[PDB]
Amino acid sequence: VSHFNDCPDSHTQFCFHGTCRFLVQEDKPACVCHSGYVGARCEHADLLA
Amino acid sequence: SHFNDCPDSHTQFCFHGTCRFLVQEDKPACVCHSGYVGARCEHADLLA
Amino acid sequence: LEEKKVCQGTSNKLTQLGTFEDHFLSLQRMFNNCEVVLGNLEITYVQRNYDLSFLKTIQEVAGYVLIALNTVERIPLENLQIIRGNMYYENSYALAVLSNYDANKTGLKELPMRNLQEILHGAVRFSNNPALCNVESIQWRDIVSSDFLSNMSMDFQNHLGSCQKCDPSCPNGSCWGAGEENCQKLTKIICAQQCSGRCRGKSPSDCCHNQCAAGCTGPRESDCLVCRKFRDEATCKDTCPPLMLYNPTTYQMDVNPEGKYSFGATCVKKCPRNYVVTDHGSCVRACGADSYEMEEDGVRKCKKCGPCRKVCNGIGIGEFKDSLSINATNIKHFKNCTSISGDLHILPVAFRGDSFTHTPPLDPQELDILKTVKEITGFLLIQAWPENRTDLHAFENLEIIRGRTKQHGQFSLAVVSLNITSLGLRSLKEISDGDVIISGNKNLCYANTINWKKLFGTSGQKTKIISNRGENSCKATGQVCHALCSPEGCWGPEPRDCV
Amino acid sequence: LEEKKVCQGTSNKLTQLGTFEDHFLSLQRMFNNCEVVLGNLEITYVQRNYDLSFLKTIQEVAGYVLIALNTVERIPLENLQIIRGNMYYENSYALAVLSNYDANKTGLKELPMRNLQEILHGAVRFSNNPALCNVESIQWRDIVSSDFLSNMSMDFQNHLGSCQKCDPSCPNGSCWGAGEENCQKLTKIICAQQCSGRCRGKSPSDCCHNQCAAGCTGPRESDCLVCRKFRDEATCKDTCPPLMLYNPTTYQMDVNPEGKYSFGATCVKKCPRNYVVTDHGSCVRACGADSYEMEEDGVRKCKKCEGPCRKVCNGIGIGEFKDSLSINATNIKHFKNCTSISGDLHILPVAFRGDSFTHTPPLDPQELDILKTVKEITGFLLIQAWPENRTDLHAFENLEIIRGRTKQHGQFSLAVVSLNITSLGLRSLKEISDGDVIISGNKNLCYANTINWKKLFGTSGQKTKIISNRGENSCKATGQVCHALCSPEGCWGPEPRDCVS
Ligand SMILES: *[C@@H]1O[C@H](CO)[C@@H](O[C@@H]2O[C@H](CO)[C@@H](O[C@@H]3O[C@H](CO)[C@@H](O)[C@H](O[C@H]4O[C@H](CO)[C@@H](O)[C@H](O)[C@@H]4O)[C@@H]3O)[C@H](O)[C@H]2NC(C)=O)[C@H](O)[C@H]1NC(C)=O
Ligand SMILES: *[C@@H]1O[C@H](CO[C@@H]2O[C@@H](C)[C@@H](O)[C@@H](O)[C@@H]2O)[C@@H](O[C@@H]2O[C@H](CO)[C@@H](O[C@@H]3O[C@H](CO)[C@@H](O)[C@H](O)[C@@H]3O)[C@H](O)[C@H]2NC(C)=O)[C@H](O)[C@H]1NC(C)=O
Ligand SMILES: *[C@@H]1O[C@H](CO[C@@H]2O[C@@H](C)[C@@H](O)[C@@H](O)[C@@H]2O)[C@@H](O[C@@H]2O[C@H](CO)[C@@H](O)[C@H](O)[C@H]2NC(C)=O)[C@H](O)[C@H]1NC(C)=O
Ligand SMILES: *[C@@H]1O[C@H](CO)[C@@H](O[C@@H]2O[C@H](CO)[C@@H](O)[C@H](O)[C@H]2NC(C)=O)[C@H](O)[C@H]1NC(C)=O
Ligand SMILES: *[C@@H]1O[C@H](CO)[C@@H](O)[C@H](O)[C@H]1NC(C)=O
Ligand SMILES: [Cl-]
Ligand SMILES: [Cl-]
Ligand SMILES: [Cl-]
Ligand SMILES: [Cl-]
Ligand SMILES: [Pt+2]
Ligand SMILES: [Pt+2]
Ligand SMILES: [Pt+2]
Ligand SMILES: [Pt+2]
Ligand SMILES: [Pt+2]
Ligand SMILES: [Pt+2]
């Protein structure tokens, strides 16, 4: 978007369960987890399923 | 003057010295034989 | 005597949890009626018109505070008085407020933290908040430890303009927002020289007790706003009153009738359930290298060995503070452990290897190392297992899972989204506390045969064992407990799989 | 860090040790270069013109201060700063100045305690000091505990004419003597309200740390004149820094690099070898009722009793024996089947003879054999009497250990004096952990010298004083040396089994 931009897709994913996006102002990658996941890298399942 | 004489000399208050009454402070005190210490001259003065 | 609604906290940093709305429900659920935050407070991506009024109850935040990428007009953290900063953000900050707006259109306008009197550790940073009003006028030298004021790399702006000037009744023109309500309260920069901590005013009779943080309503201990270190009923102590006191004229330990135990940052009459009691009148989650555990008659208390069993740290602490899972790199350290002080995580990353973290795949065979682990003090979270392993054989000797620490504050054992056909947990005889969730294992067939209640050791423990392999299909394919198992089910189809 | 010379102090109260001439010597001997009296400071019966200048070095007194029946004119306790009051005189006073005058109203006149600024515990009591000057001007409200001011019994009615005027520069005409240097230095009543204890001035910037006793030279915790409780090297602390500190965040116990051990009123880096080390980071004299002492590496620690363990018995001078002078009829009742004595054993002549002042029936000498089961004595063993029908310390034939955590007169762990025994007979004795040994005045004793006492000494400094018993040349003459089979190092008797090796 405006705060974000593509993310160099490495062989091993940065966001285990969601998509990466590079946010411009902080110049670093972040995630947008798939429903049912949490974590800085969307690595945990919300056991509160 | 400051001293009198001790009461019921039963047994003995002082173990190693003579008993004397302190007229003033109103109470018995002791005078130990050389080589002893204590309010009742009960202890040998080990330091020697 | 006077609790205080406490809650978990989060660590998603700049990540979004699904849609804005989804993300928002997650936030609201994690901090609803919360007064104390043991973890961090992360307010991110909240959009315009979402009500954050529920945030008014937050009084303390133990970790750090991250406010970022919010377009909402106001974040009413009106009662947050303290940010301890036990754990930081991006290595240096206890308070980070970043990029709060969208396309130079709308953004975070007001952040009325008129009671934020103290930040014990860590620095503060503000960046790209083009609509934030007033915060610039704040005198941080009254809130952040001097040994942190230098790491402060802030930068404000008024590219919104709809900013009102601080009320004329404010100090040196300092405020957190419009109104006299939001004027900045000074409590460390205007104090009388003869004073150590915070103060009510500049009067020598207006100083606070050393154990006071932020400010105080009086000159005494029971008169603090928030406690510096420990909290005892209604007092702030540097350390909890010992259960025993030494007697200088007895060379003996006398029993202090006014003694209490250390439990986190609070002193209490007796340690809670499932914690260990030490010789020092404190409640710990793990003993020392030399000690072990004893109970059945009283409370689990540590002692001391020489044939002590090997105790290895768990993922999350020790040499694995920022380690996501058991992996190729670390699996060596769990050498020949019998007990884990902490938790065990096994995520899919462990098998794929991880670039961003320089970790190569883990050889499935390696997991057999865990066969010596007989007990786990924290929790066991399994989100992945080697592709061709029928069950969790590597844990078939695990006897006790204590739950001293739990996933998301709730779960003690979490087995989800695997392809195992049976559990295999043959030795699992006790799950001290915490809930058990075994879901999304499409081919898992014996889970429900086990009577879990018989393994629990705390009230309220429940299970969530659904959406695995359908009972009907398990029966059809004949995958049920062996004939010699009329008792409490089995952990697999095998005879030795029976409870 | 201990920076002052100590000494024992006395407990003679109003008793006089022989002739005024002798009495003085003891006094002079017991306090000569003393700076800290661990016990009581008793200056009594000192006569006119006797030099007491050796009292200028005294700085503090743990127990009480008794000044009575002295005709000497000046008692220069010029540097005494604090009287802790750990033990009282007459059950109430930490300081008692009583009847210090001869016949013709001649007596003590100058008691310039120009530094006495604190009496932590106990009341003060002046009385019958016909010649005592200045002292009446003293304001004891800045010196004594606010809890004993009413327990007070001051008085200084004298010959106003023989007493000089304080001095212009004295706070409320308060002085201990003539001249400025004796004006009553104040450090409590003149404090800037907001302070919690002694101060060093009237200003709010001028007051002492909460732990400072008497007074201070700074505002910190290392500027105290003297400490109220513990002493941690150069600081005064409410408690010694614990070896372990709870970690509120991680919920576990951390190691405190500032950790120290609590020994009496000090914070030390290590506990004394003879002492027990508890799990609370402190040196103790003994363990609990359902435990015992274990040896390991070097430090001695306590351990829970596996079963109905070895029975321990309180000694004389502790517990229900705090005021017992010796094992006696009334006592014995409690010393049967004892295996260890936690504390001390005192055997005085009073035992067998009986005391009427404490209605203590005579003792049956035969009964002391119940002690035969005692193998350990935590403190010291003092023997001043022994049944006449015994030639060796029979009842102690099994004693193997004397730790000496406590010592008679602060010096001895073994004191056998003036008995009629022929041989010690301490065949099992294997260790005297601490403290000196004295064996003297036993006219018939013959082998005490053959023992290699230094072999039984587990603490540097320990020494023996084995004299005035039955002479060596006399013991040899009647052939009372160690047996031939004792080729080794001495014996405890003449028989073969009294040998050491
Ligand atoms: C597999 O196991 C190994 C070992 O258990 C584990 O390695 C650990 O990786 C983490 C980071 O992933 C290391 O800790 C980090 O070290 C960096 C040093 O540059 C620090 O900067 C980090 O601090 C914070 O700030 C960083 C910003 O610069 C962030 O990127 C970071 O996330 C932190 O917020 C952090 O301390 C750790 O030292 C190693 N351990 C060892 C001994 O190698 C690995 O991550 C595991 N892999 C997986 C995916 O399970
Ligand atoms: C009371 O104590 C004093 C001082 O004692 C001394 O100092 C203490 C701090 C300790 O360290 C003691 O161990 C030490 O003795 C006694 O007075 C002192 O007596 C000694 C005699 O032993 C004098 O020693 C002198 O030494 C020089 C050589 O350096 C000789 O030439 C002298 O002939 C003499 O032996 C010492 O001068 C003296 N101190 C002074 C200068 O005042 C005192 O005797 C003692 N009272 C008693 C007997 O208990
Ligand atoms: C947000 O929290 C409130 C909490 O309301 C009550 O008071 C809290 C201190 C705590 O004790 C809660 O358990 C109480 O319920 C929730 O409001 C309650 O909702 C329930 C139904 O879910 C209802 O029966 C109560 O009457 C409500 N209490 C009130 C406000 O009067 C609310 O549902 C929570 N929403 C979330 C999870 O975001
Ligand atoms: C003999 O032993 C008895 C018992 O311990 C002693 O009696 C105590 O005497 C003191 C005197 O100060 C009292 O305070 C105690 O209360 C007494 N104890 C009991 C229970 O009677 C007695 O003093 C001893 N005889 C001596 C000292 O020679
Ligand atoms: C002592 O004298 C001072 C004058 O310097 C006075 O302030 C104080 O009140 C007096 N103390 C008494 C006895 O009240
Ligand atoms: Cl490591
Ligand atoms: Cl490693
Ligand atoms: Cl199987
Ligand atoms: Cl000196
Ligand atoms: Pt959550
Ligand atoms: Pt700043
Ligand atoms: Pt204890
Ligand atoms: Pt045990
Ligand atoms: Pt003495
Ligand atoms: Pt008085």
Coordinates of C-alpha atoms in Angstrom, one line a residue, chain C residues 225-428:
Chain C
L225 CA 0.4 5.5 43.6
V226 CA 2.3 2.5 42.3
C227 CA 4.9 0.4 44.0
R228 CA 8.6 0.6 43.1
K229 CA 9.4 -3.0 43.8
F230 CA 7.2 -5.3 45.9
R231 CA 3.6 -4.7 47.0
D232 CA 2.4 -6.0 50.3
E233 CA -1.3 -5.6 50.9
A234 CA -1.4 -1.8 50.9
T235 CA 2.4 -1.1 51.3
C236 CA 5.4 -0.8 48.9
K237 CA 8.4 -2.7 50.2
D238 CA 11.9 -3.2 48.7
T239 CA 11.6 -6.8 49.7
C240 CA 8.9 -8.9 51.3
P241 CA 9.1 -9.4 55.1
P242 CA 11.2 -12.6 55.7
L243 CA 9.6 -15.6 57.4
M244 CA 12.6 -15.7 59.7
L245 CA 14.8 -13.0 61.3
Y246 CA 18.3 -13.4 62.7
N247 CA 18.8 -12.5 66.4
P248 CA 22.0 -10.6 66.9
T249 CA 22.1 -11.7 70.6
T250 CA 21.2 -15.3 70.1
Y251 CA 23.0 -16.2 67.0
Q252 CA 19.8 -17.9 66.1
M253 CA 16.9 -17.5 63.7
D254 CA 13.7 -16.3 65.2
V255 CA 10.3 -16.7 63.5
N256 CA 8.9 -13.4 62.2
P257 CA 5.2 -13.4 62.9
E258 CA 4.7 -10.8 60.2
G259 CA 6.5 -12.7 57.4
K260 CA 5.2 -13.4 54.0
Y261 CA 6.2 -15.0 50.7
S262 CA 7.5 -13.5 47.5
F263 CA 5.1 -14.0 44.5
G264 CA 6.0 -11.9 41.5
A265 CA 5.9 -8.3 42.7
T266 CA 3.6 -9.1 45.6
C267 CA 3.9 -10.5 49.1
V268 CA 1.3 -13.1 50.3
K269 CA 0.4 -15.3 53.2
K270 CA 1.0 -18.6 51.4
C271 CA 2.2 -19.6 47.9
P272 CA -0.5 -20.3 45.4
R273 CA -1.3 -23.7 43.9
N274 CA 1.3 -25.4 41.7
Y275 CA 4.2 -23.1 42.6
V276 CA 7.2 -24.2 44.7
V277 CA 8.0 -22.9 48.1
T278 CA 11.6 -22.1 48.9
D279 CA 13.7 -21.9 52.1
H280 CA 13.7 -18.1 51.5
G281 CA 10.0 -17.7 51.9
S282 CA 9.3 -17.3 48.2
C283 CA 7.3 -18.9 45.4
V284 CA 9.3 -20.1 42.4
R285 CA 8.5 -22.0 39.2
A286 CA 11.7 -24.0 39.2
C287 CA 14.2 -25.0 41.9
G288 CA 18.0 -24.8 41.7
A289 CA 20.5 -27.2 40.1
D290 CA 21.0 -29.0 43.4
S291 CA 17.4 -29.2 44.6
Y292 CA 14.3 -31.2 43.5
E293 CA 10.6 -31.4 44.5
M294 CA 8.6 -33.0 47.4
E295 CA 4.9 -32.8 48.2
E296 CA 1.9 -35.0 49.0
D297 CA 2.0 -33.8 52.6
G298 CA 1.7 -30.0 52.4
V299 CA 3.0 -28.1 49.4
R300 CA 5.6 -28.8 46.7
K301 CA 8.9 -27.6 48.3
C302 CA 12.4 -27.7 47.0
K303 CA 15.2 -29.2 49.0
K304 CA 18.7 -30.3 47.8
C305 CA 20.3 -33.4 46.3
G306 CA 24.2 -35.1 44.7
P307 CA 22.6 -37.5 42.2
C308 CA 20.4 -34.6 40.9
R309 CA 18.6 -35.3 37.6
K310 CA 19.6 -33.2 34.6
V311 CA 17.4 -30.0 34.3
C312 CA 17.5 -28.3 31.0
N313 CA 16.0 -24.9 30.2
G314 CA 13.1 -24.7 27.8
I315 CA 12.4 -22.7 24.6
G316 CA 11.8 -19.1 25.6
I317 CA 14.3 -18.6 28.4
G318 CA 18.0 -19.3 28.9
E319 CA 20.1 -19.7 25.8
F320 CA 16.9 -19.9 23.8
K321 CA 15.3 -16.6 24.6
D322 CA 14.4 -15.7 21.1
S323 CA 14.2 -19.3 19.7
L324 CA 10.8 -20.2 18.1
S325 CA 11.2 -23.9 18.4
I326 CA 13.3 -27.0 19.1
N327 CA 15.6 -26.9 16.1
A328 CA 18.7 -28.3 14.4
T329 CA 20.8 -25.8 16.2
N330 CA 19.5 -26.2 19.8
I331 CA 18.4 -29.8 19.9
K332 CA 21.9 -30.7 21.0
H333 CA 21.5 -28.9 24.3
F334 CA 18.6 -31.0 25.4
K335 CA 21.3 -33.6 25.5
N336 CA 20.0 -36.2 27.9
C337 CA 17.5 -34.2 29.9
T338 CA 15.0 -35.7 32.3
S339 CA 13.1 -32.5 33.1
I340 CA 12.5 -29.3 31.3
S341 CA 12.3 -26.1 33.4
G342 CA 10.1 -24.2 31.0
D343 CA 8.3 -25.1 27.9
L344 CA 8.8 -27.1 24.7
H345 CA 7.7 -25.7 21.3
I346 CA 7.9 -27.7 18.1
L347 CA 6.8 -25.7 15.1
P348 CA 6.9 -26.5 11.4
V349 CA 9.9 -24.2 11.1
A350 CA 12.0 -26.8 12.9
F351 CA 11.7 -29.2 10.0
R352 CA 11.9 -26.6 7.1
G353 CA 14.9 -24.8 8.6
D354 CA 14.8 -21.0 8.8
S355 CA 16.8 -18.6 6.7
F356 CA 16.1 -15.3 8.6
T357 CA 17.5 -17.1 11.6
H358 CA 20.3 -19.2 10.1
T359 CA 18.8 -22.6 11.1
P360 CA 18.9 -25.7 8.9
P361 CA 16.3 -28.4 8.8
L362 CA 16.1 -30.7 11.8
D363 CA 16.7 -34.4 11.2
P364 CA 13.5 -36.1 12.3
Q365 CA 15.7 -38.8 13.9
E366 CA 17.0 -36.1 16.2
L367 CA 13.8 -35.9 18.1
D368 CA 14.5 -39.2 19.8
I369 CA 16.8 -37.2 22.0
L370 CA 13.7 -36.2 24.0
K371 CA 13.0 -39.8 25.2
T372 CA 14.7 -38.9 28.5
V373 CA 12.4 -36.0 29.3
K374 CA 10.1 -37.3 32.0
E375 CA 8.6 -34.0 33.1
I376 CA 7.9 -30.5 31.7
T377 CA 7.3 -27.7 34.2
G378 CA 5.8 -25.3 31.7
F379 CA 3.8 -26.4 28.6
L380 CA 4.2 -28.7 25.6
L381 CA 3.1 -27.1 22.3
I382 CA 3.3 -29.2 19.1
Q383 CA 2.3 -27.6 15.9
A384 CA 4.4 -29.9 13.7
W385 CA 5.8 -33.4 13.7
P386 CA 7.9 -35.4 11.2
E387 CA 5.9 -36.2 8.2
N388 CA 6.2 -40.0 8.4
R389 CA 5.8 -40.6 12.2
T390 CA 2.6 -42.2 13.2
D391 CA 2.6 -40.8 16.7
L392 CA 4.6 -38.8 19.3
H393 CA 6.9 -41.7 20.2
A394 CA 9.7 -39.3 21.2
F395 CA 7.5 -38.3 24.2
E396 CA 6.3 -41.8 25.2
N397 CA 8.1 -41.5 28.5
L398 CA 6.9 -38.0 29.4
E399 CA 5.2 -38.5 32.8
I400 CA 4.2 -35.1 34.1
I401 CA 3.3 -31.7 32.5
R402 CA 2.9 -29.2 35.3
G403 CA 1.6 -26.1 33.5
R404 CA 3.5 -23.6 35.7
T405 CA 3.5 -21.6 32.5
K406 CA 0.9 -21.9 29.7
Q407 CA 0.4 -21.1 26.1
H408 CA -1.6 -17.9 25.7
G409 CA -2.0 -18.1 29.5
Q410 CA -4.4 -21.0 29.1
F411 CA -2.9 -24.2 27.6
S412 CA -0.6 -26.7 29.2
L413 CA -0.7 -29.3 26.3
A414 CA -1.4 -28.2 22.8
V415 CA -1.3 -30.8 19.9
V416 CA -2.7 -29.2 16.7
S417 CA -2.8 -29.6 12.9
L418 CA -0.6 -32.7 12.7
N419 CA -0.8 -36.0 10.7
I420 CA -0.2 -38.4 13.5
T421 CA -2.7 -41.3 13.8
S422 CA -2.4 -41.8 17.6
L423 CA -0.8 -39.8 20.4
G424 CA 1.5 -42.4 21.9
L425 CA 1.8 -40.6 25.2
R426 CA 2.1 -43.8 27.2
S427 CA 3.6 -42.4 30.3
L428 CA 1.6 -39.2 30.6

